[PDB]
Design a protein around this ligand. Structure first.
Ligand code: P7F
Length: 268
């Protein structure tokens, strides 16, 4: 007459497989090297070729098209908006989340979504570049570094995080629980029912700890390593939000999608 924590871990994993269009298995199949192979974006010529095939509407304007850096900024936001939708549906599988007040659900997702985004982003990155456009492009790390300031500063810290995160060799069953734990942080600003959220967090972290013990018997410190990665992600998001605000204020053509503007509003 006890919680079945192995069953819960499997439920979370199944919800992750159902709700996220990208996962580490899918990404690795593509990155390894037959249908729909990824178009490689390594310079301005190949960026523009990729846009004409994969986001035609964005470049179907005359000399009215935006600057390449602003077009990339827009494409990045589009993926974030879609991933926020996936994360919101995923969160329903977390025991207790759907029993919280709506306002607390909103607050947890508001602070958690970009931590989860950058954790899952790691799965589509290697040291040379990253998958984009639902696995149909691969944009090189060096090309993103070549963009004009400040746009060249967006992705490189995420690559830095990812290279170390990927060295932990998590699989999707681990990542699903890590993303659930990110969402269940009881110390987010503005929460109403802190006590119930702390209990929800305790439960999901217990599931995560036991799962890592079973799935990674070789790495006895993997759980505290991941606790530290959660704190690293919070700092990564804080710095990212600061850069997004600089771009919003100084780049008149770089607009922010209204759903993301609300996420960023009063966040840090
Ligand atoms: C800039 C403001 C924006 O910052 C960022 C910063 C880093 C990452 C993102 C979201 N992201 C990159 C999409 C790039 O998308 C294209 C698409 C086409 C293209 O050219 C053809 C170029 C880039 C992403 N990928 C993922 C894959 C798996 C899981 C989660 C994922 O998250 C947004 C924000 O804050 O929303």
């Amino acid at each position: 007459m006890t919680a079945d924590l192995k069953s819960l871990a499997k439920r979370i994993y199944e919800a992750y497989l159902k709700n996220f269009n990208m996962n580490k298995v899918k990404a690795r199949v593509i990155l390894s090297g037959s249908n729909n192979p990824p178009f490689v974006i390594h310079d301005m010529e190949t960026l523009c070729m990729a846009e004409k095939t994969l986001v035609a509407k964005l470049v179907a304007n005359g000399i009215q098209n935006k600057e390449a850096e602003v077009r990339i900024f827009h494409c990045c936001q589009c993926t974030s908006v879609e991933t926020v939708t996936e994360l919101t549906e995923f969160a329903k599988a977390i025991p207790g989340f759907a029993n919280l007040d709506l306002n607390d659900q909103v607050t947890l997702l508001k602070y958690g979504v970009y931590e989860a985004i950058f954790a899952m982003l790691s799965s589509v990155m290697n040291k040379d570049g990253m998958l984009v456009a639902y696995g149909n492009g691969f944009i090189t790390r060096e090309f993103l570094k070549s963009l004009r300031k400040p746009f060249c500063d967006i992705m490189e810290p995420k690559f830095d995080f990812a290279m170390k995160f990927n060295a932990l060799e998590l699989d999707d069953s681990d990542i699903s629980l890590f993303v659930a734990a990110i969402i269940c942080c009881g110390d987010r600003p503005g929460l109403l029912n802190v006590g119930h959220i702390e209990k929800m967090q305790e439960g999901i972290v217990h599931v995560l700890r036991l799962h890592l013990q079973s799935n990674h018997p070789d790495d006895i410190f993997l759980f505290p390593k991941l606790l530290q990665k959660m704190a690293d992600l919070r700092q990564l998001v804080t710095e990212h939000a600061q850069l997004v605000q600089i771009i919003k204020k100084t780049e008149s053509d770089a607009a922010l999608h209204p759903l993301l503007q609300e996420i960023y509003r009063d966040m840090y």
